[PDB]
Structure 1
Amino acid sequence: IIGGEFTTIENQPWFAAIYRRHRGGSVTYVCGGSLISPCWVISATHCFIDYPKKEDYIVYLGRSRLNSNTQGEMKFEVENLILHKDYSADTLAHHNDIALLKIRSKEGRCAQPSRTIQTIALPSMYNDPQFGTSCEITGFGKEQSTDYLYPEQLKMTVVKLISHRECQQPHYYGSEVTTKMLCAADPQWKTDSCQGDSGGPLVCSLQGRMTLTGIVSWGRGCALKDKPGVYTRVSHFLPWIRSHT
């Protein structure tokens, strides 16, 4: 997250931190995710496509820090890694960028809700907030493009949803952004998601309910003028999510 605010997991209790174990025992951070039911975390296919081996991955819930323990945190393995069959990537745009991770503890249990671990509501069909709506994003991704390490503390920021018409302008993304994608950015281009935030939530208060409207997917650079963050439009994928869970 470029700019924005340091946060803690109680403020973002659906947030899932996903890491990959390497041969030799080193563990690196991959991407964010969101808990949509006790056994299911939703993320982005692009985070796993090149290493699609579910045994490699560790998922934490209730975690506020990248490489230290948070009280109440819970550690999981991936029982099922489900990537979208029609995923593809162009030069900038990623398509069908959505993935589900069925999580289980070493004892075979799913998440136990607490003050720091909660599910986030899915949106209803064809129901997204109006452009101009302010929504939040959360993640452990880069704070500046010159960063070679991720921040140790979780971050969040607030961005505004941008219309499809605006996002398809020639100086934005033209026809590379589709109706299955949502653009969001800061009017001053000072805050944005960045590399490492992918897979994480774009949450909007929708009819008084905190809703998983988007999943961090792609964008040109980070907090670059006329280059919004692009998010998987979760509301388009409800049948896929329902069939695979």
Structure 2
Amino acid sequence: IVGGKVCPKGECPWQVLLLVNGAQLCGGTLINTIWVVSAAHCFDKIKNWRNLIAVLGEHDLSEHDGDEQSRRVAQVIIPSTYVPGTTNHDIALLRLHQPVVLTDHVVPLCLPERTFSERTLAFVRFSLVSGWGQLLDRGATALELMVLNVPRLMTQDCLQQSRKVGDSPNITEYMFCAGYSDGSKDSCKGDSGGPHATHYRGTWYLTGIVSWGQGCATVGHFGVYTRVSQYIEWLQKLMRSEPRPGVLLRAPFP
């Protein structure tokens, strides 16, 4: 998160930090006590599937107060259509070994109805992304949770305003861009998997997932987000269906 404020403690309670072997990995979003949405490609290089750890309630990485809750990740689920090392279908669903406990510092983000998201939410101009990622492309990561407020664009406005670059990814139906072009503010490498959250009439909803861009706050580019609207049926089907055995699982999509 380049350009943001520090998120005052407890004010981004759906934020999740994923760890492997106690090393920083990605962010995630609590949509449920048992369930965390992340970015698929966070798992591109994963060799140690038993040691995936999810941490809710976290704020400051260096010092541990009483609010952080740790849980083992039981299953990571990826869309069938996701291809490792590409940016399409960039989303992950994670079941935690055991539930977290909702408190003033751990709360799930509402996962909205798909049509509500398409017709109403998509047209709230500013939403919040957040995470412990880099504070500048190639720079340090964050110790306290960071948060940034960003304007969404419709894909045509995005293509028009973006600078054509040889062999860049295609902005798809399963993405959107958000943010700025004056090279001042964006999400960044630490942040993949974390919330793009939309306030509407007193309730925060999950509309996006930090996914990819051309470096971070590059002049002439925006940040791309997984378009969370497209997977609402798929996620729901998964949270209600009965557990499959495997640790990684590629679910059919749609």
Please indicate the TM-score interval, normalised by the length of the shorter structure: 0.7 to 0.9
Is the 1:168–1:175 contact (alpha carbons within 8 Å) kept by the matching residues of 2?
Answer: no
- Partner of 2:50: helix, strand, or coil? helix
Match of 1:140 in 2: 132
Structure 2 distance, partners of 1:5, 1:181, is 25
Q: Tell me, yes or no, if the aligned pair for 2:87 and 2:169 is still in contact at 8 Å.
A: no
Q: Could you tell me which residue of structure 1 aligns to residue 56 of structure 2?
A: 61
Q: CA deviation at 1:55?
A: 1.0
Of 175, 190, 199, which residue of structure 1 is paired with 2:193?
A: 199
1:9 CA drift (Å): 4.1
**Alignment counterpart, residue 121 of structure 1, candidates 89, 99, 110:** 110
Whether the 8 Å CA contact 1:9–1:62 is kept in 2: the answer is no
- Determine which of 206, 210, 232 is the counterpart of 1:216: 210
In structure 2, the residue matched to 1:4 is: 4
Q: 1 CA distance for matches of 2:141 and 2:65? A: 17
- Residue 246 of structure 2 corresponds to none
- Deviation of residue 167 (structure 1)? 1.6
* Partner of residue 171, structure 2: 177
Q: CA deviation at 1:187?
A: 5.5
Secondary structure in 2 aligned to 1:63? coil
Helix, strand or coil: the match of 2:147? strand
How do residues 37-186 of structure 1 correspond to structure 2 at under 5 angstroms?
Answer: 37-51=32-46, 53-88=48-83, 94-104=87-97, 109-126=98-115, 127-128=117-118, 129-131=121-123, 133-147=125-139, 149-169=140-160, 171=163, 176-186=170-180
- Confirm or deny that 1:235 pairs with 2:249: no
- Larger strand percent: 1
Compared CA separation, residues 52 and 45, structure 1 to 2 (3 A): farther
Q: How far apart, CA to CA, are the structure 2 residues paired with 1:145 and 1:180?
A: 25
Q: Tell whether the 8 Å contact from 1:19 to 1:28 is kept in structure 2 after alignment.
A: yes
In 1, Cα distance between the equivalents of 2:156 and 2:38?
A: 26
Work out which of the residue numbers 15, 18, 23 in structure 2 matches 1:28: 23
Compute the displacement of 1:162 (Å). 1.0
Contact 1:17 1:61 in 2 (8 A): yes
Task: Give a deviation string over 1:92-119, Cα, whole Å, max 9, x none.
Answer: x601111011113xxxx30111110000
Unpaired segments ≥5 residues, structure 1 = 22-26
TM-score norm. by structure 1 comes to: 0.88
Contact preservation (8 Å) 2:57, 2:105: yes
TM-score (norm 2): 0.85
Q: Does structure 2 conserve the Cα–Cα contact (< 8 Å) formed by 1:168 and 1:176?
A: no
Give aligned pairs, total.
Answer: 233
SS state at 2:141 partner:
coil
